[PDB]
Design a protein around this ligand. Structure first.
Ligand SMILES: [Br-]
Ligand SMILES: [Cl-]
Ligand SMILES: [Cl-]
Ligand SMILES: [Cl-]
Ligand SMILES: [Cl-]
Ligand SMILES: [K+]
Length: 387
């Protein structure tokens, strides 16, 4: 429960599991030792290319081993990464970079980037200049230092910048009791990198010694995904509601190859969960995530199909408060508030942060909560349910 910055956890994990497979792309496999060496070589290049701690650096790199190498190397030098979907239109990309205050954009295709205040660097040319020579003077990083910026948005899709601390994703190295996950597991990287949900896949894998098999770039091809799940022995499968429901409709057997399936997003129609759970013995979970809590935040194990939020992940606390910030009684409707290691550092404007990140005395601690938009209450057993 003493959390470190991501590069420090990864250093420990890679030293402890150097021979385990960290990344799979098509049929290419990269051990933790190989990945660690490439991250170190690239971090030295990034220091050579005038990046420093605190720099806001966007990443626009298609799914590939290099994408994750850049994530690790940027965090090692203390940069704040801003991952961008490669399929996003140029205007929304400019909107994201402007919202984030990005100063640099690292891309695997510099010809498809919007013009703005940022400086564009070529990921492929940077990789090309990597030497075996590792370097050495990296910044001291706290679990509370910024690591990442994700966007959230309302009805109109205008992006709002969310600053994520190292601890917010470093917590994903803590094994989740309901999942039973460990270094023996394999995850599938398919969520878009600009989504908090992508952190579930990347960091639960790489901060535990487990394997991350990387989906091909582009929109999902369920035949290729089904082959990938089987061929690469995916054991922890995170799916959006849409991808989950579509697999139920067209290939439900694929869902029972893994040990655990976690469904993120707005609740899928329970009839579809009913079909899925009747079709095999995989443990199927409804997951609750929140961009302002960095990643997946709670899990409810669906055995039969309001919506229970289930059991929070390690170092996550959840409470339902009403409009006057009082803990709700049974059946009283309020909002879900989330506290703990995942809570974002805030938004880019501090007046926006002050109204949604609220300190409330709870069970003896003056605890910082994020106020979600999720309406909720308590059931008769003091379990949180969404309404
Ligand atoms: Br649905
Ligand atoms: Cl090993
Ligand atoms: Cl903002
Ligand atoms: Cl991609
Ligand atoms: Cl999530
Ligand atoms: K969900």
């Amino acid at each position: 429960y003493q959390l470190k910055a991501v590069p420090d956890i990864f250093d420990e994990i890679s030293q402890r599991f150097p021979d385990r497979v960290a990344l799979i792309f098509d049929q290419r496999k990269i051990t933790y030792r190989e990945l660690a060496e490439q991250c170190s070589a690239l971090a030295a290049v990034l220091q050579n290319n005038c990046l420093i701690k605190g720099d806001i650096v966007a990443i626009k790199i298609e799914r590939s081993p290099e994408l994750y190498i850049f994530m690790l190397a940027l965090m090692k030098i203390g940069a704040v990464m801003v991952p961008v979907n490669s399929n996003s239109p140029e205007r929304y990309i400019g909107e994201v970079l402007s919202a984030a205050g990005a100063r640099y954009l690292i891309s695997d295709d510099v010809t498809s980037v919007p013009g703005g205040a940022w400086h564009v660097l070529s990921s492929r040319t940077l990789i090309q200049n990597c030497t075996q020579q590792r370097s050495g003077n990296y910044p001291v990083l706290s679990a509370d230092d910024p690591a990442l910026i994700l966007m959230t948005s309302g009805s109109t899709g205008k992006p709002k910048s969310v600053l994520i601390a190292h601890r917010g994703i470093a917590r994903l190295g803590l094994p989740v009791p309901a999942l039973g996950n460990s270094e023996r597991d394999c995850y599938l990287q398919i969520a878009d990198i600009s989504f908090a949900a992508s952190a579930n896949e990347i960091w639960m894998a790489l901060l535990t010694g487990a394997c991350l098999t990387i989906a091909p770039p582009g929109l999902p091809d369920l035949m290729a995904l089904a082959r990938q799940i089987e061929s690469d022995n995916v054991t922890m499968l995170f799916l959006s509601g849409g991808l989950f429901r579509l697999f139920v409709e067209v290939s439900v057997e694929t869902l029972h190859i893994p040990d655990c399936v976690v469904v993120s997003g707005d609740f899928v129609n329970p009839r579809l969960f009913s079909v899925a759970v009747q079709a095999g013995k995989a443990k199927i979970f409804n997951g609750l995530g929140c961009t302002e809590n960095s990643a997946i935040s709670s899990l409810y194990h669906i055995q039969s199909a309001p919506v229970p939020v289930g059991t929070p992940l390690p170092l996550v606390e959840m409470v339902v408060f009403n409009e006057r910030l009082q803990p709700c009684t049974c059946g009283e409707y309020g909002e879900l508030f989330i506290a703990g290691a995942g809570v974002a550092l805030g938004y880019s404007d501090p007046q926006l942060t002050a109204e949604r990140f609220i300190t409330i005395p709870y069970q003896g601690t003056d605890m910082l909560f994020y106020r979600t938009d999720d309406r909720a209450t308590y059931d008769q057993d003091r379990n949180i349910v969404l309404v």
